[PDB]
Amino acid sequence: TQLITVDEKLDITTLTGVPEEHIKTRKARIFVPARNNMQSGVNNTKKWKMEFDTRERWENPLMGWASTADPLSNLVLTFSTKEDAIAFAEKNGWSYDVEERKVPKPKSKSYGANFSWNKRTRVSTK
Amino acid sequence: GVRTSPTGEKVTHTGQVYDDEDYRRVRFVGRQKEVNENFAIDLIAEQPVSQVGSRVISCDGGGGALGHPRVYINLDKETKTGTCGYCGLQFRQQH
Amino acid sequence: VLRLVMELSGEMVRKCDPHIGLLHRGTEKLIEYKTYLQALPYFDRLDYVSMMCNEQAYSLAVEKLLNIQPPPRAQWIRVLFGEITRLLNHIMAVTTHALDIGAMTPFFWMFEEREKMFEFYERVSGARMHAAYVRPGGVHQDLPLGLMDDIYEFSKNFSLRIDELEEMLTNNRIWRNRTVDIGVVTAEDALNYGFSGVMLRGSGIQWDLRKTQPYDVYDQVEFDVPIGSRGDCYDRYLCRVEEMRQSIRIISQCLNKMPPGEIKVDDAKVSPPKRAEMKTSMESLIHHFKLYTEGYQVPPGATYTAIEAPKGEFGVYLVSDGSSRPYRCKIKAPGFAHLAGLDKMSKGHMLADVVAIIGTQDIVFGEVDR
Amino acid sequence: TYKYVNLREPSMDMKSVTDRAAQTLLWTELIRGLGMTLSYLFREPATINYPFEKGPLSPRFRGEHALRRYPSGEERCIACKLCEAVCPAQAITIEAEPRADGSRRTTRYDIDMTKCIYCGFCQEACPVDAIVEGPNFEFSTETHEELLYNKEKLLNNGDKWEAEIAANIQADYLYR
Amino acid sequence: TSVKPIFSRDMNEAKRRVRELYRAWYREVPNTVHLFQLDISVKQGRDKVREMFKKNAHVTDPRVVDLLVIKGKMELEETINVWKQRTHVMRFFHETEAPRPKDFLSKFYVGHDP
Amino acid sequence: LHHAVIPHGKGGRSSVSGIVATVFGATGFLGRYLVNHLGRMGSQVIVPYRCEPYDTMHLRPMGDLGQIIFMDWNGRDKDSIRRAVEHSNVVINLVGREWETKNFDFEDVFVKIPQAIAQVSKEAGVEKFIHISHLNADIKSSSKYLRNKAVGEKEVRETFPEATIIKPADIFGREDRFLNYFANIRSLGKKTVKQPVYIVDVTKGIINAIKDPDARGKTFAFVGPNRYLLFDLVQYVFAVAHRPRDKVERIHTTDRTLPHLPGLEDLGVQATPLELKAIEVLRRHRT
Amino acid sequence: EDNKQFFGRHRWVIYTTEMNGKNTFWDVDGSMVPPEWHRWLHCMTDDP
Amino acid sequence: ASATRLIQGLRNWASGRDLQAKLQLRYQEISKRTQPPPKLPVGPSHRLSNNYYCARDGRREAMPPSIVMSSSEKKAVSPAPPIKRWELSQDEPYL
Amino acid sequence: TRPTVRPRNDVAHKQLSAFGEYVAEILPKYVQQVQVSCFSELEICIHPDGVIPVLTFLRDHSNAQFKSLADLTAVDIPTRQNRFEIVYNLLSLRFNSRIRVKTYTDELTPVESSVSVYKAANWYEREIWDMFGVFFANHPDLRRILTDYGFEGHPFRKDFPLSGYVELRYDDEVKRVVAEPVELAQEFRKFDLNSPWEAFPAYRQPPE
Amino acid sequence: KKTTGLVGLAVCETPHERLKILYTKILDVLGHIPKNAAYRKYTEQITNEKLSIVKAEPDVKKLEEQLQGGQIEEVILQAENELSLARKMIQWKPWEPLVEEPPASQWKWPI
Numbered sequence A: 001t002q003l004i005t006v007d008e009k010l011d012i013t014t015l016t017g018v019p020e021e022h023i024k025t026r027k028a029r030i031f032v033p034a035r036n037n038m039q040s041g042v043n044n045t046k047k048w049k050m051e052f053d054t055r056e057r058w059e060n061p062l063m064g065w066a067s068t069a070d071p072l073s074n075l076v077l078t079f080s081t082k083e084d085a086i087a088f089a090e091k092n093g094w095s096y097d098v099e100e101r102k103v104p105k106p107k108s109k110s111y112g113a114n115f116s117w118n119k120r121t122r123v124s125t126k
Numbered sequence B: 001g002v003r004t005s006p007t008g009e010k011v012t013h014t015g016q017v018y019d020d021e022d023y024r025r026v027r028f029v030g031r032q033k034e035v036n037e038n039f040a041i042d043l044i045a046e047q048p049v050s051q052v053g054s055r056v057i058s059c060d061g062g063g064g065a066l067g068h069p070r071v072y073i074n075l076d077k078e079t080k081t082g083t084c085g086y087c088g089l090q091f092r093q094q095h
Numbered sequence C: 001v002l003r004l005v006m007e008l009s010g011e012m013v014r015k016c017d018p019h020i021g022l023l024h025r026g027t028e029k030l031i032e033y034k035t036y037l038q039a040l041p042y043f044d045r046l047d048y049v050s051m052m053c054n055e056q057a058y059s060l061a062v063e064k065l066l067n068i069q070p071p072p073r074a075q076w077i078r079v080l081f082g083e084i085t086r087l088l089n090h091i092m093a094v095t096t097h098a099l100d101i102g103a104m105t106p107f108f109w110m111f112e113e114r115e116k117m118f119e120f121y122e123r124v125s126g127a128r129m130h131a132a133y134v135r136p137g138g139v140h141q142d143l144p145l146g147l148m149d150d151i152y153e154f155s156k157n158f159s160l161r162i163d164e165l166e167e168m169l170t171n172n173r174i175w176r177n178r179t180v181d182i183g184v185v186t187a188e189d190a191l192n193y194g195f196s197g198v199m200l201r202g203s204g205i206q207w208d209l210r211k212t213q214p215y216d217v218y219d220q221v222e223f224d225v226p227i228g229s230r231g232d233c234y235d236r237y238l239c240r241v242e243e244m245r246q247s248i249r250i251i252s253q254c255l256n257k258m259p260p261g262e263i264k265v266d267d268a269k270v271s272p273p274k275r276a277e278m279k280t281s282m283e284s285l286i287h288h289f290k291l292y293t294e295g296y297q298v299p300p301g302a303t304y305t306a307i308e309a310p311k312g313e314f315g316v317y318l319v320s321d322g323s324s325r326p327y328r329c330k331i332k333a334p335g336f337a338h339l340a341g342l343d344k345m346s347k348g349h350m351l352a353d354v355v356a357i358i359g360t361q362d363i364v365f366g367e368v369d370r
Numbered sequence D: 001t002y003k004y005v006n007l008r009e010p011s012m013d014m015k016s017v018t019d020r021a022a023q024t025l026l027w028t029e030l031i032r033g034l035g036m037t038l039s040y041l042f043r044e045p046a047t048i049n050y051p052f053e054k055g056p057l058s059p060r061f062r063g064e065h066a067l068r069r070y071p072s073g074e075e076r077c078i079a080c081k082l083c084e085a086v087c088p089a090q091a092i093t094i095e096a097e098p099r100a101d102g103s104r105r106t107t108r109y110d111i112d113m114t115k116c117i118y119c120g121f122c123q124e125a126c127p128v129d130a131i132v133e134g135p136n137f138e139f140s141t142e143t144h145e146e147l148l149y150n151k152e153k154l155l156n157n158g159d160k161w162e163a164e165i166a167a168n169i170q171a172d173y174l175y176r
Numbered sequence E: 001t002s003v004k005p006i007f008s009r010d011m012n013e014a015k016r017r018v019r020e021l022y023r024a025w026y027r028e029v030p031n032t033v034h035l036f037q038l039d040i041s042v043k044q045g046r047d048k049v050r051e052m053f054k055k056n057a058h059v060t061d062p063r064v065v066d067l068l069v070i071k072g073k074m075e076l077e078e079t080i081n082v083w084k085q086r087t088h089v090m091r092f093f094h095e096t097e098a099p100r101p102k103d104f105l106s107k108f109y110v111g112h113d114p
Numbered sequence F: 001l002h003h004a005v006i007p008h009g010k011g012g013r014s015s016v017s018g019i020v021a022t023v024f025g026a027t028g029f030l031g032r033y034l035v036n037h038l039g040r041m042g043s044q045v046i047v048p049y050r051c052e053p054y055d056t057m058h059l060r061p062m063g064d065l066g067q068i069i070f071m072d073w074n075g076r077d078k079d080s081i082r083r084a085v086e087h088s089n090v091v092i093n094l095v096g097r098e099w100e101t102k103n104f105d106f107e108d109v110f111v112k113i114p115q116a117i118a119q120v121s122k123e124a125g126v127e128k129f130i131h132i133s134h135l136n137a138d139i140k141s142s143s144k145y146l147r148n149k150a151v152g153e154k155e156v157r158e159t160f161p162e163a164t165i166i167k168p169a170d171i172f173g174r175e176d177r178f179l180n181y182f183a184n185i186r187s188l189g190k191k192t193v194k195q196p197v198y199i200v201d202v203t204k205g206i207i208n209a210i211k212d213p214d215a216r217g218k219t220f221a222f223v224g225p226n227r228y229l230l231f232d233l234v235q236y237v238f239a240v241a242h243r244p245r246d247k248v249e250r251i252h253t254t255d256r257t258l259p260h261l262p263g264l265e266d267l268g269v270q271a272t273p274l275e276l277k278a279i280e281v282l283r284r285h286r287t
Numbered sequence G: 001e002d003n004k005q006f007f008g009r010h011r012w013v014i015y016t017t018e019m020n021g022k023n024t025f026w027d028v029d030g031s032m033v034p035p036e037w038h039r040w041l042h043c044m045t046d047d048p
Numbered sequence H: 001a002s003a004t005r006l007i008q009g010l011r012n013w014a015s016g017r018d019l020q021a022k023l024q025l026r027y028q029e030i031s032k033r034t035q036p037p038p039k040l041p042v043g044p045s046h047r048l049s050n051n052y053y054c055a056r057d058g059r060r061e062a063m064p065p066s067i068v069m070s071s072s073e074k075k076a077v078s079p080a081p082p083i084k085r086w087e088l089s090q091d092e093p094y095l
Numbered sequence I: 001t002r003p004t005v006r007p008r009n010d011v012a013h014k015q016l017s018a019f020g021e022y023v024a025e026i027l028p029k030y031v032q033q034v035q036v037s038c039f040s041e042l043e044i045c046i047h048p049d050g051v052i053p054v055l056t057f058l059r060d061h062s063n064a065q066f067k068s069l070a071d072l073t074a075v076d077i078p079t080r081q082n083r084f085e086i087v088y089n090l091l092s093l094r095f096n097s098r099i100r101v102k103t104y105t106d107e108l109t110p111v112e113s114s115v116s117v118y119k120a121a122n123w124y125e126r127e128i129w130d131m132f133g134v135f136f137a138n139h140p141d142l143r144r145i146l147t148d149y150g151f152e153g154h155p156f157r158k159d160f161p162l163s164g165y166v167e168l169r170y171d172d173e174v175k176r177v178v179a180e181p182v183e184l185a186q187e188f189r190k191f192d193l194n195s196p197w198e199a200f201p202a203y204r205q206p207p208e
Numbered sequence J: 001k002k003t004t005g006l007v008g009l010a011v012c013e014t015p016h017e018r019l020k021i022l023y024t025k026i027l028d029v030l031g032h033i034p035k036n037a038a039y040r041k042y043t044e045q046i047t048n049e050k051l052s053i054v055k056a057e058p059d060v061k062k063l064e065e066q067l068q069g070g071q072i073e074e075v076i077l078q079a080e081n082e083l084s085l086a087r088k089m090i091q092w093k094p095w096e097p098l099v100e101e102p103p104a105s106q107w108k109w110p111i
């Protein structure tokens, strides 16, 4: 009730219990996931996924499976703004690589321009 | 119709048989590598190539709601039989 | 399986710490990493003695979020199997209470009758116990022709057998001596400790989720829930047996009031179609394919619902992203709520009475983990 | 509507109170319980002699995880990955390849019997009825290596019988 | 910015509660290593205790210190009862390797661990 | 060499580690701990037995899913032994009852068993064959045990010459023989100076030497850290345990260093003393 | 198959000796039936 | 059952419930298996010519929740009408 | 729209709208939202200081009785600074209605331990402390219940991945059971099922 | 009465004047509360409605089916807890204007 409050940083990584091997060695990456190019629809955009980089996946020598010694291998954290992403990553301690968002560039096309006269943009097929 | 590779044992209908330098052959010691010896590709020659008088014909699979779904295949390839991707059995055209 | 660290003044008590969490399995986390239709059986098996009301509550959670009502034959068949499940959980809770209190034989009598009931599940779906069988969107793959007459047979013979159970026990002198004085519950306790169902029936207040908020066609059968008066464990025992006999009533009226509509919804974008249209469509094939790959998308928002498990308030709380994965499921468990007040239920007794207390609130310990 | 219990009083009339006293000092309804139990003694008990007589079932039991094949034909599985897409403990493992013919097929079709909870979802999800939950349920396997099915084990197990599977499906391909 | 902390004002009360918690662990150790019929010298166990303390001396934010004090108090309670068994107490130790050092060339032999 | 003998990733629990080990024995004591440390390393172990499968059953789940594999061997035929060592990276030889049986002496197990297995091994092409031996097993007297071991030592040294002949001193641990005989007393007291070596440093040394190449050809000997009198050690045993013919001769016989051959320090393993582990292992006294 | 017993004692097999050849006069396993009899014996039908 | 009348009478004398009548061993009314194959109904859809899916789109009827607040009024009502107390059902209550 | 799509009652909607407006205007110190969904179940969204005062109001007052307590979980939402949501769920014996008291909270600052008025909340708050680490000042006993003792990490967060970090095995070396870093036997595959194409046009959010 | 349907609650003999001194104490402790807020309005209006229910009727069973809160003694207990919130809400000032706002991109759901 109107207590101590001091304007500083945060150090939660000494509390969330994941060991320090995984703290300092593993590396995070924040990116908007690209449109999977075969479909053309960008509802899969608008989010900022935090992922971890991949590591070794050998052969399971009895069945032909891919085991791993990576508990963090299948994290994903879908966010809504780059600021809160970076704030969370620095709040929880490990390092992070920021790739920036890329919209499709707006264009200038028209069907009448596909029916040109002395301009070379000509439909040529139909 | 199995092969005996120079490792010395049965092979399957997938190209997966071993090398001599393997420990997995010796973990097969005492218990037999069971495998279906009624292979797959040899049950294509047993099926006759039917000859239908039509042109754009049907394949169902021997049973209404028992098998693979309907697919209509064409016979335009004059020397090549139509092949259902599901069935595996062939068709021809008779003018 | 529990851990009980009790602290007792001699052949009496003072306190008891129920160390529970032996049976934690991480169910909510695993559902947070799966889809709806895939992760239904976790809801089937967190509780396990009651086994189709769990299905029923999850299916009603999804159908209530998705604003889709099942066809009426689905509702009545779901009511029938809710009554079978109610009958089954109360008969096993009575018999495991009897077996742990002593009393070797009625356990085996009622388990032969339950063996008929597992034959009925087998004929319905095929599984012994954990039949999934209740999809969201109504029941899947309806009953084979020749089951309702078997249920009619079971109703007759089982009325006879449960009257023979009350022939054996209930005016048993020393079983009454064994459990009358123990397990008192104040109405203020029954509110503040968050009790659910049979404890509320037993101690005072007339209360039923089924009756007050009829979440299905329960509103259109004549039945009457038994209430307790003294708020007591023998009285609670009689309450359970008469809820079984009321379930006999509900099965009889359900068989006489059956509409022959259809199994699933015809909104094929939620329930998958059947084989004939599947093997020759195009839209039904696509719906089959993507409906089993992705899972249908579920509009965002957080819902809660609760039905009357034979324990009590089986509550379930979904939080959905616009997604086919639920963002957060969570389950209100009557086992957890009933284990919650154990000190204030057992301050003034001794240890065999404590084992009777663990009996008289029906436990599975699967569901107490959530 | 409610129908509650335990609302009476012990009747103060002399006959009823001496009847409760007669039960107290004469051990009566205990002997009534003995009479009911001896009535169940003199019935015939219902056991099934297990290794000979087998307990009844449905046509739609979920057992063995067997495969099917076409009439004098090849493997019914297209390797369309739906069963591994639905498998709620992911015990299916499919790696697919075409062969020298052209029809798309498999390489590796593995069922873990440990993770397989025996849903039925992979049966319902199969578009061509390739995988079928089998009829018999007798696995009883002494070693944990031996509980990890290969595609060849599934094909042998689908060729130790189809006739049971075919009879069950041909009876009940109309419900599902 | 309003932040309502647990116990702390400055780190003086932090120092006070943490030194008392260490005193509680000091008189906690010999009773437990006698009770569980353990097999480790008291010197070694106490030095692993103070080593676990000396791991997290690098944090000055006082709310973090409060939550650490409450965690350590929880497990001192749960080992001063008999609620934790032999397994968890040994699990604090590492007598089963776990061999991996931080040499460059050692991790270059057993590959792909940068 | 082919893949799936190369190491993969980190260690433990079916990480595909290096060695594929055929072990003769391992149903006894030291081989059981050795299979344990190879399961921690994550190595596939082929072990044949001869007894009831109940004993190999209670040492079965040491490995992960299906790593270790069980088969049969016998002290007579080369065909079963050869089938058991058809494919092996390494092979270790640890065998021996410490009393003559009806059908076996100290002769011909120590003599005849390394003959046939080394025969099919050198015809087979195994590498890093590790043969144990008791320490100070001489041509000299007092033990058919020790002299048959010396004959076997000369056999394994002569044919298949680059075997690591290894020898610990007499080991103690959870299932020691001589400390158990110290518990199974009555009494008699003599003098002999003696160094005891604990079992886990021995088996750590064996797995480290078998996984680390270039350390081959040389016989090794493992050293106890204390090296004092036997009777003082018996007084130590009774003190810590709260209470006041071939085995006793073969502990009174010979305990010494051999300065020719290299020991622990060519391996980099810490020596666990007698006192620490002896206090750890002396349970089963009065209250 | 007898009719006057109850449902669970209609259809019983009597195994013979050494059908695969493993002295199965004694120690009778399950699954020693061919599959069409594995339909009939498990009460999935009413005709042999 | 399947037993003589003296011990039948002893069963009914130990429990006067006419045990020979209904005994929980089923004989006649086991469902006579291999029933005729059923034809299912198809419900209030596949109806041609009128089923616009535009109408019955229960997924798209999900409104976002309305928001009454932010970050001489005739009021103080209850969330519901207060619940009427029930009745003892006539079908043999106690008492 | 009428067959097989569940119809509703606007009457219950109007009742809950009026009731939420009432509660919001008579406890204005803490109310920020009263939202009503389509199918009439009330949500009240509350600052983390009116926990004790608002629950003391909502237990009583004879216009909203609501004795019955249920779930408390604090649904872990990143892309916030106040991450966790403490969700009380309340039921009226007298009025047959469900109100969700959603209060918000951060990682480290406690809410005020609702066990003072709710004797059912004891193991609920203990569960929240064990799975998350949300602290409850002024509480009788906080322990780890529904976890192992020697285990830590607060696993129902999103930072805790699906497998645990530790994994037990017995070993005969030290004759007991130990914990090791996790050596999975298979990957736990991860299906990118989040399909595009805007399945609900009404719940669109404005992009930037 | 005679042995009511609840459990930890035995029947009272003088319901009426006990209930009346309950509600007059509610009016007293409401008289402690400041004026301008409508919390006083709603509590005063409902309490005078309920007191007008009880003053006009000396009956028992008609008094139950008119005055809600079946059967009777729950109304007394509920009056006690209504006094309890009254005492606790002299303090804590629920009607005074708000403490600060959330960061306002918090309560919207679909993330």
Ligand SMILES: NC(=O)C1=CN([C@@H]2O[C@H](COP(=O)(O)OP(=O)(O)OC[C@H]3O[C@@H](n4cnc5c(N)ncnc54)[C@H](OP(=O)(O)O)[C@@H]3O)[C@@H](O)[C@H]2O)C=CC1
Binding pocket: F024, F025, F026, F027, F028, F029, F030, F031, F050, F051, F075, F094, F095, F096, F097, F098, F104, F109, F132, F133, F134, F135, F168, F169, F170, F171, F172, F177
């Ligand atoms: N202090 C010590 O004990 C020391 C011992 N050593 C040596 O270490 C080795 C292992 O010792 P230890 O474990 O104590 O003794 P064991 O008797 O237990 O080890 C020998 C193993 O091989 C088996 N075996 C022995 N003879 C035969 C046979 N004829 N046929 C089949 N199997 C046989 C044994 O029994 P089974 O057949 O039932 O499997 C056992 O599994 C011995 O060779 C010993 O000389 C070396 C230095 C010190």
Ligand code: SF4
Binding pocket: D076, D077, D078, D079, D080, D081, D082, D083, D084, D094, D125, D126, D127, D128, D129, D130, D131
């Ligand atoms: S669903 Fe059927 S056909 Fe498709 S991959 Fe699975 S088993 Fe094969």
Ligand code: SF4
Binding pocket: D083, D086, D087, D088, D089, D090, D091, D092, D111, D115, D116, D117, D118, D119, D120, D121, D122, D123
């Ligand atoms: S029954 Fe279920 S768990 Fe088993 S393979 Fe099929 S889908 Fe997977």
Ligand SMILES: [Zn+2]
Binding pocket: B059, B060, B061, B068, B071, B084, B085, B086, B087, B088
């Ligand atoms: Zn075809």
